[PDB]
Design an enzyme around this catalytic site. Structure first.
Site, PDB file in Angstrom:
ATOM      1  N   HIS A 104     -10.479  12.891   0.742  1.00 24.03           N
ATOM      2  CA  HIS A 104     -10.329  11.757   1.639  1.00 24.03           C
ATOM      3  C   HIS A 104      -9.645  11.892   2.996  1.00 24.03           C
ATOM      4  CE1 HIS A 104      -9.903   7.595   2.709  1.00 24.03           C
ATOM      5  NE2 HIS A 104      -8.592   7.651   2.608  1.00 24.03           N
ATOM      6  N   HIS A 122      -8.564  10.714  -2.714  1.00 25.45           N
ATOM      7  CA  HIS A 122      -8.342   9.337  -3.096  1.00 25.45           C
ATOM      8  C   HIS A 122      -8.763   9.282  -4.553  1.00 25.45           C
ATOM      9  CE1 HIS A 122      -7.919   5.034  -2.056  1.00 25.45           C
ATOM     10  NE2 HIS A 122      -8.500   4.944  -3.238  1.00 25.45           N
ATOM     11  N   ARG A 168      -0.024   8.237  -6.408  1.00 27.41           N
ATOM     12  CA  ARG A 168      -1.391   8.599  -6.105  1.00 27.41           C
ATOM     13  C   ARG A 168      -1.758   9.869  -6.846  1.00 27.41           C
ATOM     14  NH1 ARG A 168      -4.286   7.511  -2.397  1.00 27.41           N
ATOM     15  NH2 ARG A 168      -4.496   8.277  -0.253  1.00 27.41           N
ATOM     16  N   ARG A 213       0.296  12.007   3.149  1.00 22.01           N
ATOM     17  CA  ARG A 213       0.282  10.789   3.940  1.00 22.01           C
ATOM     18  C   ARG A 213       0.533   9.550   3.113  1.00 22.01           C
ATOM     19  NH1 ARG A 213      -3.581   6.759   5.223  1.00 22.01           N
ATOM     20  NH2 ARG A 213      -4.840   7.876   3.664  1.00 22.01           N
ATOM     21  N   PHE A 270       0.820  -1.203   0.000  1.00 19.88           N
ATOM     22  CA  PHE A 270       0.000   0.000   0.000  1.00 19.88           C
ATOM     23  C   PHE A 270       0.861   1.263   0.000  1.00 19.88           C
ATOM     24  CE2 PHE A 270      -4.608  -0.545   0.488  1.00 19.88           C
ATOM     25  CZ  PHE A 270      -4.687  -1.933   0.525  1.00 19.88           C
ATOM     26  N   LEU A 322     -15.508   5.470  -0.952  1.00 18.10           N
ATOM     27  CA  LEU A 322     -14.232   4.896  -1.327  1.00 18.10           C
ATOM     28  C   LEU A 322     -14.227   3.488  -1.923  1.00 18.10           C
ATOM     29  CD1 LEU A 322     -11.186   4.932  -1.338  1.00 18.10           C
ATOM     30  CD2 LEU A 322     -11.233   4.392   0.996  1.00 18.10           C
ATOM     31  N   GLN A 340      -5.669  15.303   1.220  1.00 18.24           N
ATOM     32  CA  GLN A 340      -5.449  14.149   0.348  1.00 18.24           C
ATOM     33  C   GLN A 340      -6.727  13.611  -0.335  1.00 18.24           C
ATOM     34  OE1 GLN A 340      -4.388  10.004   1.917  1.00 18.24           O
ATOM     35  NE2 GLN A 340      -2.484  10.762   0.989  1.00 18.24           N
ATOM     36  N   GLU A 350      -7.725   0.850  -2.721  1.00 17.67           N
ATOM     37  CA  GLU A 350      -6.623   0.733  -3.666  1.00 17.67           C
ATOM     38  C   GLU A 350      -6.495  -0.743  -4.023  1.00 17.67           C
ATOM     39  OE1 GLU A 350      -2.428   1.306  -2.335  1.00 17.67           O
ATOM     40  OE2 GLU A 350      -2.265   2.601  -4.115  1.00 17.67           O
TER      41      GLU A 350
END
Ligand SMILES: *Cc1cc2c(cc1C)nc1c(=O)[nH]c(=O)nc-1n2C[C@H](O)[C@H](O)[C@H](O)COP(=O)(O)OP(=O)(O)OC[C@H]1O[C@@H](n2cnc3c(N)ncnc32)[C@H](O)[C@@H]1O
Ligand SMILES: CC(C)=CCC/C(C)=C/CC/C(C)=C/CC/C(C)=C/CC/C(C)=C/CC/C(C)=C/CC/C(C)=C/CC1=C(C)C(=O)c2ccccc2C1=O
Ligand SMILES: CC(C)=CCC/C(C)=C/CC/C(C)=C/CC/C(C)=C/CC/C(C)=C/CC/C(C)=C/CC/C(C)=C/CC1=C(C)C(=O)c2ccccc2C1=O
Ligand SMILES: CCCCCCCCCCCCOCCOCCOCCOCCOCCOCCOCCOCCO
Ligand SMILES: CCCCCCCCCCCCOCCOCCOCCOCCOCCOCCOCCOCCO
Ligand SMILES: O=C([O-])CC(=O)C(=O)O
Ligand code: SF4
Ligand code: F3S
Ligand code: FES
Lengths: 577, 243, 130, 119
Positions: A356, A233, A288, A391, A117, A243, A231, A246
């Site tokens: 997110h 997503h 990302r 992050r 991740f 969400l 941030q 990932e």
């Protein structure tokens, strides 16, 4: 007001608050800990985490590797001495949660399995299944039931805190069912209220994530650090903003445009990898930010599929196989089927970028303490300086237990050596919270809170999104300024006492406007592009370590203005270059 | 375009004015995606700001959603207007006191849940030693029963509960079972008392409605039956021990 | 004092009449009655069987009513509904893992139904072929 | 608050029986009701398979005695157990219900036992 005596009071029963309550209860078996939350602990956001919690475990890994990852990912805006402390404690915390019963997925030999991740080279993310947060929050909550020291105030909306002569003395909350105010006295208070995503029109967050804690600290001179780094997503459902982990991609999913073209190759993340082998760092497993930006770019070219819920791109997962589709990722396949009505085995999932996580949060030292003696912050609502300008995936849950344990232990110490305060002052504070509350209640103007809320979200979505321009940031600042003025003409038509959500939602809205303004000003002021903060204006499109390798401190004065100040970033072994 | 409208009947109740709950009707816009939670929002935003209810995640994972839709316990956020074009009546979660509008007293549930010690007991291993060793095989023993979001829909479904408010309940027992079945726990005895109670597994006559409604397919019913079987073994063991 | 006035909805003796799922439940428990009735009948027969052929014929005469034939026909239906439902439920009592997965109930439901069929046959054979 | 030290219930005994009973009447009760409640009184059987003499012959056998007993008793313990609770489900107040139904069971059990040691 009725009064309660507690050694320490914790505001928030999420990952962090709970881990905090327990560490405090084990530290001092005789303490009386007041754990407060506006919803029963298990309804906290943490429950919705699906990816995993980072913690070094494979033999070929090293704390160094996790440290580096964390620092680079944060574009060097991380407090390096903190990151170190973090990586070194993860293994312990994740292991402890295992001992408490958290059912982490396993390797055939009984050991705990891990997966990749945040784009880390060495996988090190522990996981429940795709129900990790649910499992961590629930293990923690349940584990906490065995310590009598913790006295819960379920469904108690903490209003404001009590400060005198630079030291915290307790807080005033409202019994939601009763509608009555309460005074909890404590020489240490831990803020573990969560992030502020909810100030955005579309987010992955739960209704409750309104930034209350941050707004509270703001009222007392404490600054919120790095609030501009929000941030997004990459893959969220249109409209709901729900969400889509990932994981989908880590398993093989691809993202395609209206032409079914895996557009990601045309943005520096090529060459295309085969439907079979996904490769970290490439295509749908690329940076990302790049992935979220690619969306924007595809949007400009007119390559996004048009839908009511909005424009989107497709998240194709068919080529995994029913068993994997239906049996392996149950929830999702259920989420997708339910909220956009689509079978991930027969069809593609519509998605787009979504607000997110909140990198910013109440400024704290390496012990989670704020500028106010005895006042600590931990969890997404804080800023230990772990995430910098971005992050790392699976690092947030880890944080919850790693620093929540610290915050708990430290707060215990700070309440033991606190000494006494001016009773007449503290009581006067409480009286003030009470008065202020009455003022809001009697406030009239015929302005609908809900519409302000809606406008606030549209502003943040347009002015503080994936790509920023001074023109639109400014526009958002101006909007928020306006909305602040409107907030004072809002009338809470419900004067009931039992579970009055009209009022509570209205209070939550206030904190949001304040928090929003620190976000915007922070961003408009950072004339550079770093991590989650990306500008398009000349001279601001690149990273500037010469002028901006520092934290943004945002303060809100009594005259309602949001002022900025900057602080340096602690480097240890990994200087920027 | 032009959105369709749906008259939704919601059972309002203000303990400061009302003597008893009473219906109210609201016209709410809706389409193939609109959920009951969505509808409730629209009402509170444009028709009745005093409509109180619980919610949070918006994705059926937190569990504060709990309520009745045409006499069937459901989650407001996983309920869709498209399936109620012939009428929709929303009431507070059954078998719980109604505090205000759609908010009920979840106290009993919490207390019950607390009563069975839902936590790893008697294991001395410490962090520095590494995690316990537990195979998928072993996990499969309790896994399904750990997916409980404490939503409360099974209690609204269980008639036994409606008839015996002192019954600790499906969820409570499932949770207990979950730990009793975790190879890492060693505190089964700490939990039996409550399970052996008349107000424990024995209060259940296997109506099975609970499992029918679990929005997370936990199958509490199956946990309770297994529970009886363990209770039963406990009752024997206790009998073959004199004194 | 509290401004909370908790409203408690009462539960009637007719709660099960509402929703089908409950109705079917009542129906399942209802099988109890015909079931004992039959046990009763067996007792009659048993004792008539002992008070000689004279009494036994009096018994057999009873079973020929034929209102008792209808009742008994109802008794057979009920009994089968019991078997139907019992086998479904019984498997929920076992927690069996077959290669990292919690199996059932189908495998068990099948077995029980097989045993019943074979038993029904062996019994009919024993009681009639000889 | 929930009693911290509740009293153990005794349901595991009755449940126990009811269990074995329910299983016996699920596998063996259909066929038996066929033979005794339908085939017998309608002559639907070959020759003298269900004639006084033959039945008696069976009943008096050892296996016949046991089978007879269980076929009668087990079902009773099941169904009476069920009617006992049905009372509650129906909200019908029955004084000493436990003694009633279960006592009825015991009595009948005994009665049955006398009969199979033969009258
Ligand atoms: C939104 C989200 C986040 C997330 C994720 C999936 C989703 C959908 N998946 C993650 C993952 O797989 N790995 C990971 O590292 N992070 C992931 N995240 C982010 C992370 O989970 C969150 O940032 C984290 O959950 C934060 O938890 P935290 O302990 O900080 O607190 P909280 O869960 O947000 O809960 C807040 C608590 O505070 C109480 N509260 C708030 N305001 C008040 C007031 N005014 N009064 C009283 N109580 C208050 C709430 O009741 C709650 O208990
Ligand atoms: C041991 C015997 C055994 C395996 C029993 C399981 C069989 C089934 C299907 C039981 C279900 C069942 C039913 C149908 C009840 O009515 C009832 C009423 C009161 C208490 C418990 C019960 C109960 O467990
Ligand atoms: C002796 C060997 C043996 C097993 C012979 C079978 C004899 C036959 C055909 C019995 C028939 C038979 C059966 C099956 C009963 O259930 C029943 C129930 C109540 C009263 C009488 C009877 C009865 O005669
Ligand atoms: C033919 C055998 C019958 C035996 C009769 C003996 C009865 C003795 C009853 C004593 C039961 C004692 O319980 C002991 C367990 O340890 C706990 C002690 O504290 C008291 C708990 O409450 C008592 C539980 O027993 C309740 C009733 O039992 C009734 C028996 O019904 C069985 C009938 O058998 C017929 C089946 O074909
Ligand atoms: C020949 C008729 C005999 C009747 C047999 C009936 C047995 C049914 C037992 C059911 C007992 C139920 O307990 C009822 C009390 O309410 C309290 C429930 O909590 C549990 C308490 O412990 C149970 C006490 O009952 C014990 C039963 O003891 C058995 C009776 O032996 C009777 C012998 O009669 C022969 C003498 O002439
Ligand atoms: O949630 C996910 O699957 C991935 C992620 O970026 C986060 O951990 O927040
Ligand atoms: S068992 Fe299912 S219905 Fe029951 S509380 Fe848990 S999740 Fe809800
Ligand atoms: S519906 Fe109630 S009766 Fe038992 S099977 Fe479920 S707890
Ligand atoms: S809002 Fe979380 S269960 Fe519905």
């Amino acid at each position: 007001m009725q009064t309660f005596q507690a050694d320490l009071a914790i505001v928030g029963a999420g990952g962090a608050g709970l881990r905090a309550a327990i560490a405090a209860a084990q530290a001092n078996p005789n303490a009386k800990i007041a754990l407060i939350s506006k919803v029963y602990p298990m309804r906290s956001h943490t429950v919705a985490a699906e990816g995993g919690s980072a913690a070094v475990a494979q033999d070929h890994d090293s704390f160094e590797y996790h440290f580096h990852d964390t620092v680079a990912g944060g574009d060097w805006l991380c407090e390096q001495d903190v990151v170190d402390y973090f990586v070194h404690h993860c293994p312990t915390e994740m292991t402890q949660l295992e001992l408490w019963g958290c059912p982490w997925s396993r390797r055939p030999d009984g050991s705990v399995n891990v997966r990749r991740f945040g784009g880390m080279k060495i996988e090190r993310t522990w996981f429940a299944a795709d129900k990790t947060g649910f499992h961590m929050l629930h293990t923690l909550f349940q584990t906490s039931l065995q310590f009598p020291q913790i006295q819960r105030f379920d469904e108690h909306f903490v209003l404001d805190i009590l400060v005198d002569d630079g030291h915290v003395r307790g807080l005033v909350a409202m019994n939601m069912m009763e509608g009555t105010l309460v005074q909890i006295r404590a020489n240490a208070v831990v803020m573990a209220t969560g992030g502020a995503g909810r100030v955005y029109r579309y987010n992955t967050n739960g209704g409750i994530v309104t930034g209350d804690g941050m707004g509270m600290a703001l009222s007392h001179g404490v600054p919120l650090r790095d609030m501009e780094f929000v941030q997004y997503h990459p893959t969220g459902l249109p409209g709901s903003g729900i969400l889509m982990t990932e994981g989908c991609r880590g398993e093989g999913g691809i993202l395609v445009n209206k032409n079914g073209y895996r557009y990601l190759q045309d943005y520096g993340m090529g060459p295309e990898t085969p439907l079979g082998e996904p490769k970290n760092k490439y295509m749908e497993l690329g940076p990302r930010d790049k992935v979220s930006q690619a969306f924007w770019h595809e949007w400009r070219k007119g390559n996004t599929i048009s839908t009511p819920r909005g424009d989107v791109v497709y998240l194709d997962l068919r080529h995994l196989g029913e068993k994997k589709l239906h049996e392996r990722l149950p929830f999702i396949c259920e989420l997708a089927k339910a909220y956009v009505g689509v079978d991930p085995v027969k069809e593609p999932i519509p998605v787009r970028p979504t607000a997110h996580y909140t990198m910013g949060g109440i400024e704290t030292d390496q012990n989670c303490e704020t500028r106010i003696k005895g006042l600590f912050a931990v969890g997404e609502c804080s800023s230990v300086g772990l995430h910098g300008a971005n992050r790392l995936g699976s690092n947030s849950l880890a944080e919850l237990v790693v620093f929540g344990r610290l915050a708990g232990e430290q707060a215990t110490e700070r309440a033991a050596t606190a000494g006494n305060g001016n009773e007449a002052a503290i009581e006067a504070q409480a009286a003030g919270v009470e008065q202020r509350l009455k003022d809001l209640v009697n406030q009239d103007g015929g302005e609908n809170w809900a519409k302000i809320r809606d406008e606030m979200g549209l502003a943040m979505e347009e002015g503080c999104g994936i790509y920023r321009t001074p023109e639109l940031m400014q526009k958002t600042i101006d909007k928020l300024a306006e909305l602040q003025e409107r907030f004072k003409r809002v009338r809470i038509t419900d004067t009931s006492s039992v579970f009055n959500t009209d009022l509570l939602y209205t209070i939550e809205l206030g904190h949001g406007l304040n928090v929003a303004e620190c976000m915007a000003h922070s961003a408009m002021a950072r004339k550079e592009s770093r991590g989650a903060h990306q500008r398009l204006d000349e001279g601001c499109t690149e990273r500037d370590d010469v002028n901006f390798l520092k934290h943004t401190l945002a303060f809100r004065d009594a005259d309602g203005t949001t002022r900025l100040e900057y602080s340096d970033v602690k480097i240890t072994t990994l200087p920027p270059a | 375009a032009e959105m369709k409208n749906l008259k939704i009947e919601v059972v309002r109740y203000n303990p400061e004015v009302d003597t008893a709950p009473h219906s109210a009707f609201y016209e709410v816009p809706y389409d193939a995606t609109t959920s009951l939670l969505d509808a409730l929002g629209y009402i509170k935003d444009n028709l009745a700001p005093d409509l109180s209810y619980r919610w949070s995640c918006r994705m059926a994972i937190c569990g504060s959603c709990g309520m009745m839709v045409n006499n069937v316990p459901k989650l407001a956020c996983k309920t869709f207007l498209r399936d109620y074009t012939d009428g929709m009546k929303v009431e507070a979660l059954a078998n719980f006191p109604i505090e205000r509008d759609l908010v009920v007293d979840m106290t009993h549930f919490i207390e019950s849940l607390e009563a069975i010690k839902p936590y790893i007991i008697g294991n001395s291993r410490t962090a520095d030693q590494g995690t316990n060793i537990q195979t998928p095989a072993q996990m499969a023993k309790y896994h399904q029963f750990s997916g409980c979001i404490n939503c409360g829909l099974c209690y609204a479904a269980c008639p036994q509960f409606g008839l015996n408010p002192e019954f600790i309940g499906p969820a409570a027992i499932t949770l207990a079972h979950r730990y009793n079945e975790d190879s890492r726990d060693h505190g089964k005895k700490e939990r039996m008392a409550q399970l052996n109670s008349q107000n424990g597994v024995w209060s259940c006559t296997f109506v099975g409605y609970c499992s029918e409604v679990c929005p997370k397919h936990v199958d509490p019913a199956a946990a309770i039956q297994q529970g009886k079987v363990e209770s039963s073994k406990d009752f024997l063991i206790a009998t073959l021990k004199p004194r | 004092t509290t401004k909370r006035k908790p409203y408690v909805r009462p539960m009637t003796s007719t709660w099960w009449k509402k929703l089908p799922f409950y109705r079917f439940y009542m129906l399942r428990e209802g099988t109890a009655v015909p079931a004992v009735w039959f046990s009763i009948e067996l007792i009659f027969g048993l004792f008539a069987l002992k008070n000689g052929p004279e009494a036994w014929a009096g018994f057999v005469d009873f079973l020929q009513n034929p209102v008792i034939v209808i009742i008994n026909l109802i008794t057979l239906a009920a009994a089968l509904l019991h078997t139907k439902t019992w086998f479904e439920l019984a498997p929920k009592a076992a927690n069996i893992i077959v290669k990292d997965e919690k199996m059932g109930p189908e495998p068990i439901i099948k077995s029980l139904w097989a045993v019943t069929v074979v038993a029904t046959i062996v019994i009919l054979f024993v009681a009639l072929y000889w | 608050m929930i009693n911290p030290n509740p009293k153990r219930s005794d349901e595991p005994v009755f449940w126990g029986l009811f269990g074995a009973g329910g299983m016996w009447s699920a596998i063996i009760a259909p066929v038996m009701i066929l033979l005794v409640g339908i085939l017998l009184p309608l002559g639907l059987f070959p020759g003298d398979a269900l004639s006084y003499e033959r039945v008696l012959a069976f009943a008096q056998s050892f296996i016949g005695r046991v089978f007879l007993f269980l076929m009668i008793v087990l079902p009773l313990w099941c169904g009476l157990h069920r009617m006992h609770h049905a009372m509650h489900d129906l909200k019908i107040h029955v004084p000493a219900g436990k003694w009633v139904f279960y006592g009825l069971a015991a009595i009948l059990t005994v009665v049955t036992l006398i009969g199979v040691v033969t009258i």
